[PDB]
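Researcher: Here's my situation. A collaborator sent me these components and asked whether they could plausibly form a single complex. I don't have experimental data yet, so a predicted model of the whole assembly would be a useful starting point for our discussion.
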Amino acid sequence: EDESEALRQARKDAELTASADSVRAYLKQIGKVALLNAEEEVELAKRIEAGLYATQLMT
DNA sequence: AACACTCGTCGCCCAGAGTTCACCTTGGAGCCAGGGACGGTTCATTTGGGGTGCCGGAAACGGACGCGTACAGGCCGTATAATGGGAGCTGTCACGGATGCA
């Protein structure tokens, strides 16, 4: 079923697939990153603002 | 069936058709001689006329020259939330060989 090495190897072998169609391959590759929410996006904005400010300072 | 009359045909004889043969004239046909005027030529004028190169300049005219306007195309931004495609139709066969699995 779910545990005892039952379907994890199936998921791994599924992810290790050619997927010769480029659109399907792109969808597979885009599938590996989780969605965000309001909090995560706002602190990401804080981080990029800090990076831009530091880059301007070094310039 | 018996009986007593008038008409082509030819020759011949004399005069001219018109034709030839053969005689005198006279208007020549042209041949040349002489004299214009004449039209073709040439050369004097004769100033009536064509002519002109350039310009003051007046006006067109061709274009430059500077400066406005005009859409065409390009860049740019829109703050609720909106977080993984439809569709494709696929009856071949031969068959050599690689090829992903045996």
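Model: Some features of this prediction you could bring to your collaborator: The radius of gyration of chain A is 19 Å. The helical segments of chain A are 8-15, 22-30, 38-58.
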